[PDB]
Amino acid sequence: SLSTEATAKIVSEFGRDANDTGSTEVQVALLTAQINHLQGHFAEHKKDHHSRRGLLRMVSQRRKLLDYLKRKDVARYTQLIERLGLRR
Amino acid sequence: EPFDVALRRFKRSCEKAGVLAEVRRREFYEKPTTERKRAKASAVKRHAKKLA
Amino acid sequence: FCRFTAEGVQEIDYKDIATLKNYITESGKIVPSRITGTRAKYQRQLARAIKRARYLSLLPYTDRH
Amino acid sequence: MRHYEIVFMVHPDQSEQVPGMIERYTAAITGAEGKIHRLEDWGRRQLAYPINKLHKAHYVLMNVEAPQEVIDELETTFRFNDAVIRSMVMRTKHAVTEASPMVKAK
Amino acid sequence: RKQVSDGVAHIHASFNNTIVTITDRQGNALGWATAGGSGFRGSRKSTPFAAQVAAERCADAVKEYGIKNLEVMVKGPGPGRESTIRALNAAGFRITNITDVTPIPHNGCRPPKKRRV
RNA sequence: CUUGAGUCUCGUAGAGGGGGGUAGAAUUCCAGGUGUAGCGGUGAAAUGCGUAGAGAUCUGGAGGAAUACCGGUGGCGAAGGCGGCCCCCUGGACGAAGACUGACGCUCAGGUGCGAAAGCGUGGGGAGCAAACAGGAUUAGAUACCCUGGUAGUCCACGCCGUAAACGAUGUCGACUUGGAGGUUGUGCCCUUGAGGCGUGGCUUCCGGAGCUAACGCGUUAAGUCGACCGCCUGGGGAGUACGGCCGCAAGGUUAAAACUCAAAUGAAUUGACGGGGGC
Ligand SMILES: [Mg+2]
Ligand SMILES: [Mg+2]
Ligand SMILES: [Mg+2]
Ligand SMILES: [Mg+2]
Ligand SMILES: [Mg+2]
Ligand SMILES: [Mg+2]
Ligand SMILES: [Mg+2]
Ligand SMILES: [Mg+2]
Ligand SMILES: [Mg+2]
Ligand SMILES: [Mg+2]
Ligand SMILES: [Mg+2]
Ligand SMILES: [Mg+2]
Ligand SMILES: [Mg+2]
Ligand SMILES: [Mg+2]
Ligand SMILES: [Mg+2]
Ligand SMILES: [Mg+2]
Ligand SMILES: [Mg+2]
Ligand SMILES: [Mg+2]
Ligand SMILES: [Mg+2]
Ligand SMILES: [Mg+2]
Ligand SMILES: [Mg+2]
Ligand SMILES: [Mg+2]
């Protein structure tokens, strides 16, 4: 749902290289942007369960990738969840 | 113009537009499950007809 | 049959009443695809265009009004 | 930006006012720097069914790219007007400049 | 007892009964007769014969209006739909054309429930 | 490490969802324009409306609900489910050719969410339909089917309920195993291209092979050959009942026995008989 501009900006920020798009930081940052954006949608559409299912799929992928990135290295995990303010 | 074969021209548009059948169909309420069951019956029949 | 593939026209226009009229009966009812030969992908766009034109009063709903 | 095709009718009696009406509709797009790819005036056309017991309504076609808020404001402006009797806004995937089928038929 | 110089026949039909009504193009009733007012009641009321009687009965009951050219609008799927047409074409009724005016709802209201028998 | 899983770029199809507008057909009611005796109803009737003008017919208005055909053997959704048109916010699937991450995966007790219809609470809304109910019939009876009415309900908003033959009576993920005819949906190639003929995918319908099955049947969308995990079954009644716990405003749901009782209960198929089932 993110525009191409926002997606490429997030990729270029959290990417080791601009070309790098599948790294765990890029993916978790895209997930975070979408999860933060859908808050305004579900603040009004409280009856939109069929989209909240996709929102839940996103928070689940984010939780799994955060677990992976934590076990893989503490450094990247700590700095990434500090930049995104996750797990405060 | 003749009145007889001007009335057979009525019984062609009338029928091919169906409305006679539509009044019978909308005469009574068909429950949606019966609608779908009858659709499936007609489907399987006019399908497996043109194989055998 | 399937005219919208011989010509190859990607989009059907609700403003082209000359084409829409060939898919509407005198009663004003859309013709099925088992009669005209149109593809399903294009029959759906035909129905959409016909309804959009009937909203703009460019086509009758019924033969009476 | 989003391309929209707007085809609105208008009361035959107020047809003289229609060139004056187009100014505010064009101005809203111009103010937002929105583009206009296709303007066509079919003119009075015979209605297939009555609309408020009226016939021979005047049809106007506009193809317009603009911010969504400007289009929403134009839609509120449409309902307020009385001469107008039908407003249709249609989001198109591209901006079409090709001649209208009605204009070609003329 | 007065002219209107033209007429429009409106054949209302129901499974139970058939109604014939001559009216001016303006929709003002000039004469009317029902297949149930022809002396046919119950089952006898609903039959092409009863509607054929009611058509001519209404024709004569309006005849003093000197109607000649008429437009026939027939409604309802019951029998006597064409029988009535023919039986009013009698007495030199110059039929312009016919039209089916049966009311067809676009999935509008809930019909009554199916009968068991 | 890149084959599993996931990300990015480009597109495609869709009744996927939420919200807001809106149009046409029809029903009903209201006011009237003409007009006359029936209307409506059924096996046949009657109750029921009608001479204070019904019904029929034309004009104008009010209102609620549902979207003829298109429509499919169609599509989308995890399932329940989803159908006029337009806009707005929005989820997923798929394809093409690449780039990137590097096992990040599968399953899942408790847990949490969603979950047809009926029903419940509060506030609306109420055209049609219609439990209870009222009358008219049928009948030996008729607390029924039939008929005229008709209330909650159906509709909306926010809560609850958590149940269905919620079914493909078939848990989820993965690999492997002869074929045929289709539908729907992308896409590579090549004809000179329009049509057209080859390749490769996604989903889906119907035949049928091996195999499997008690049989019926299933059959590359397995009920075949296997692996991972979870749920569940242990004769028929008693009983999905009791008691207790948890949950619910309530209806109730969920978890879930025993005593006793019987020697069967059951599945599929077969041969007849029978049918107010057909065809000759
Ligand atoms: Mg995505
Ligand atoms: Mg009835
Ligand atoms: Mg939709
Ligand atoms: Mg009156
Ligand atoms: Mg599907
Ligand atoms: Mg569980
Ligand atoms: Mg309910
Ligand atoms: Mg309630
Ligand atoms: Mg209430
Ligand atoms: Mg009843
Ligand atoms: Mg009723
Ligand atoms: Mg109650
Ligand atoms: Mg179901
Ligand atoms: Mg089960
Ligand atoms: Mg499998
Ligand atoms: Mg098979
Ligand atoms: Mg298996
Ligand atoms: Mg088995
Ligand atoms: Mg036991
Ligand atoms: Mg219990
Ligand atoms: Mg208890
Ligand atoms: Mg058996």
mmCIF file of C-alpha atoms (C1' of nucleotides) in Angstrom, chain F residues 215-217 268-273:
data_model
loop_
_atom_site.group_PDB
_atom_site.id
_atom_site.type_symbol
_atom_site.label_atom_id
_atom_site.label_comp_id
_atom_site.label_asym_id
_atom_site.label_seq_id
_atom_site.Cartn_x
_atom_site.Cartn_y
_atom_site.Cartn_z
ATOM 1 C "C1'" A F 215 -18.559 -51.329 -0.992
ATOM 2 C "C1'" C F 216 -20.030 -46.950 -2.921
ATOM 3 C "C1'" G F 217 -16.662 -44.549 -4.719
ATOM 4 C "C1'" A F 268 -22.340 -50.063 1.780
ATOM 5 C "C1'" A F 269 -24.191 -53.057 -1.654
ATOM 6 C "C1'" U F 270 -27.784 -57.316 -3.474
ATOM 7 C "C1'" U F 271 -32.638 -60.002 -4.739
ATOM 8 C "C1'" G F 272 -37.395 -59.112 -4.486
ATOM 9 C "C1'" A F 273 -41.782 -56.559 -2.941
#
